[PDB]
């Protein structure tokens, strides 16, 4: 199974952001893909990165990235929604390979909620 080149570009963008903290670079790179109807994949990949990460740096930085991209209208309401729903669907698969993932997901969802970037009902759909 070959690497979907859009998945690969999103993964590189996210990895470069975790190094530099340059949100601007990340936002520019994302928009240049010209793939607004695939922004749910960016959301999904970013949250998976949080879940697979050790400690708190990736968690804090992806939270800040998502808040910024939502606040600049770069990620639309329904792309945010579709990304989180994918996570909600796969979290039993993820938690089996990464223990304590349900707990990291719950805290991340609550932070996004407290930031004002997700609705009450998306927060409440968290398993």
From Swiss-Prot:
Q: Which keywords appear in this protein's UniProt record, sorted alphabetically?
A: Acetylation, Apoptosis, Cytoplasm, Nucleus, Phosphoprotein, Repeat, RNA-binding, Tumor suppressor, Ubl conjugation
Its quaternary organisation is:
Interacts (via MI domains) with EIF4A1 and EIF4A2 (via N-terminal domain). Heterotrimer with EIF4A1; one molecule of PDCD4 binds two molecules of EIF4A1. Interacts with EIF4G1. May form a complex with EIF4A1 and EIF4G1. The interaction between PDCD4 and EIF4A1 interferes with the interaction between EIF4A1 and EIF4G. When phosphorylated, interacts with BTRC and FBXW11.
Processing and modification events after translation = Polyubiquitinated, leading to its proteasomal degradation. Rapidly degraded in response to mitogens. Phosphorylation of the phosphodegron promotes interaction with BTRC and proteasomal degradation.
Q: According to its UniProt record, in which tissues is this protein expressed?
A: Expressed ubiquitously. Highyly expressed in thymus and liver. Moderately expressed in brain, kidney and spleen; weakly in lung and heart. Expression is up- or down-regulated in response to apoptosis inducers. Regulated by many programmed cell death-inducing stimuli.
Q: What does this protein do?
A: Inhibits translation initiation and cap-dependent translation. May excert its function by hindering the interaction between EIF4A1 and EIF4G. Inhibits the helicase activity of EIF4A. Modulates the activation of JUN kinase. Down-regulates the expression of MAP4K1, thus inhibiting events important in driving invasion, namely, MAPK85 activation and consequent JUN-dependent transcription. May play a role in apoptosis. Tumor suppressor. Inhibits tumor promoter-induced neoplastic transformation. Binds RNA.
Lineage, please? Answer: Eukaryota, Metazoa, Chordata, Craniata, Vertebrata
Q: Where in the cell is it found?
A: Nucleus; Cytoplasm
Name of the protein: Programmed cell death protein 4
The Gene Ontology CC terms held by the record are:
cytoplasm; cytosol; nucleus
Q: What species was this sequence derived from? A: Mus musculus
